[PDB]
Amino acid sequence: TNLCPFGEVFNATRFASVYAWNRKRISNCVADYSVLYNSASFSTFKCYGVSPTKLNDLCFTNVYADSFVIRGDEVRQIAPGQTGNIADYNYKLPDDFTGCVIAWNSNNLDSKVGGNYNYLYRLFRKSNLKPFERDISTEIYQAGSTPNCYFPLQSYGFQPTYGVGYQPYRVVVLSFELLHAPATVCG
Amino acid sequence: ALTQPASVSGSPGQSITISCTGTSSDVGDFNYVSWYQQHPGKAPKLMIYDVTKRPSGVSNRFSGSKSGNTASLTISGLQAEDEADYCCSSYTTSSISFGGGTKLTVLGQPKAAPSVTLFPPSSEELQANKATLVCLISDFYPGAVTVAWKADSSPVKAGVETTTPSKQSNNKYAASSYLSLTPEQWKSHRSYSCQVTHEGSTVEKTVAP
Amino acid sequence: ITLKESGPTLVKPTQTLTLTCTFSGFSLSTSGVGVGWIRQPPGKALEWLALIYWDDDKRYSPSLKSRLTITKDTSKNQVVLTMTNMDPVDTATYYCARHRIGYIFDYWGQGTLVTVSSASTKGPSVFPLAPSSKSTSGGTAALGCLVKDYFEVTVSWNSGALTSGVHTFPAVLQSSGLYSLSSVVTVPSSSLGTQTYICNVNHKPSNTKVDKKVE
């Protein structure tokens, strides 16, 4: 009977940096996905392996909602099969992804005068991330052999004067898992 | 960083535009432009934000737009009430920028003769061995006056200090002129006068011990 | 809904300005909100000074950064600006206002006049301007009071009860370097001696109020 609390996800007062991306577990509730699909406030709403209309007809055992901020250039990396700084080193979708990727421009909230530095991404890692892996370490990366050593995170520095490719976007990734277990999230 | 014309003029009922140019190296994509209205001696009031949006309670006669690095505030159906300075604001990569105002003058306003009240020195100020005459000028529309003082009939130029004109709520202008003198100079002389000349015509008021 | 700067202040050259903004109607803890300080030198352009965000990020004029500081106290709903090595070129009205990026600044305070001068503070001499037969224009009589030799006052009448017909004139700068102004109210001629009229003169730099009866 409880309605799925998507507002705590899409309307949260803080979003995570992408290297420390947040995961919300959604359970034991009814979700109307069309309410979101038809708001017209989303510059991205791309569903993989399912249609958003059919999604209100379906039940799942859990729904995961992963959210973070990236720059607009990098929204295309939040998709099955992609490479890049974000896909390889921050947030990686499986090639078989069944879910939806929702994004919107947040320049009026996430930039600030002189730059907003709170949002970081990982620039260097020893290997690519596995799907849905998270790395929050702050170890100095070695590109060489001395104890050519770099701090592994870089700030986005969001500026209100940037063009759209460099403006901040809030992203929400909905994963629908279907397991041989009781389903708890239905439309 | 932001450059505005010093002045713009429009006649009632018609539409006027105030332009706001930002240096290309300073404003980037020039995403957020706000417009402020400030009336003399009062705080800025937000009329347009985000280039085109009106806060609630701002009239639809105010509109904003942008093209390249030039934003424009447009006012339609000009009323006398909206004479003011209009100031634009935007971001640079390091700061908030404003650039100078644009004074908007609504034309066709009726000419108006000054209203003059002249006050003698108070008895309480006279006790303290000082004396001041107070000539208050108000409600003249062409915003310049000339003020001449005279004791009996002799022109007085000493101890006269006159404010520059200032614009009132009703878009007319006001000024004030003070003549300072010793109590015994005031008891001496039958009468003191304040002569306000406006547009070649003179309104004169006399006061007497 | 509201912002208000602290009182008008005289500041000696090379010493430091301190202003406090007290606001109401919104929290400086809510995301995206900030509170900033902007000044306007007499007859000159608005100049942004400083900003403080909900998360305690601070930003300053790049050219004035070494002299500025801004602090917030969300419990007292106040924001505090400090500026150092004050000079007479810094004489200006100083405004606080609410920031949210999308609109830059929406609600502004009324502004507070900061004066940088070595000259000392002088409170006002308030003298009545009695109504008379020579200040009578039909049904309307003019009365006022004269605020003389101060260093820059507000005037109300009958503690704010009397507002219509009030015209407080801008002040004259005497060759002595002190200021004087006058406020006059037009009342009904019959009213005189039936109604008691007081002018309330607040300086604030000298922490001086005077309520002068006018008879």
Residue numbers in the entry:
A (entry chain E): 333 to 479, 487 to 526
B (entry chain C): 3 to 211
C (entry chain B): 2 to 152, 154, 156 to 218
Q: What does the study report here?
A:
The omicron variants of SARS-CoV-2 have substantial ability to escape infection- and vaccine-elicited antibody immunity. Among the total of 476 monoclonal antibodies (mAbs) isolated from peripheral memory B cells, we identified seven mAbs with broad neutralizing activity to all variants tested, including various omicron subvariants. Biochemical and structural analysis indicated the majority of these mAbs bound to the receptor-binding domain, mimicked the receptor ACE2 and were able to accommodate or inadvertently improve recognition of omicron substitutions.
The other two antibodies in group 1 bound to the outer surface of RBD and belonged to the class 2/RBS-C/RBD-4 community (P5S-2A9) or class 3/RBS-D/RBD-5 community (P2S-2E9). The footprint of P2S-2E9 extensively overlapped with that of LY-CoV1404 but was rather distinctive from that of REGN10987 and S309. However, binding to the surface-expressed SBA.1 protein was not affected despite its reduced neutralization to BA.1 compared with that to wild-type D614G, suggesting the reduction in neutralization was likely a collective effect beyond binding alone. It is also possible that the enhanced binding of omicron variants to receptor ACE2 (5.5-fold to 18.4-fold) rendered their competitive advantage over P2S-2E9, and indirectly compromised the neutralizing activity of P2S-2E9. In mice infected with beta, P2S-2E9 treated mice remained healthy and survived infection for 14 d, while the untreated group exhibited progressive body weight loss from 3 to 5 d post infection and all succumbed to infection by 5 d post infection. No detectable levels of live viruses were found in the lungs or brain of P2S-2E9 treated mice on day 4 post infection. In the P2S-2E9 group, no damage or pulmonary inflammation was found in lung tissues, while untreated mice showed severe inflammatory infiltrates and edema.
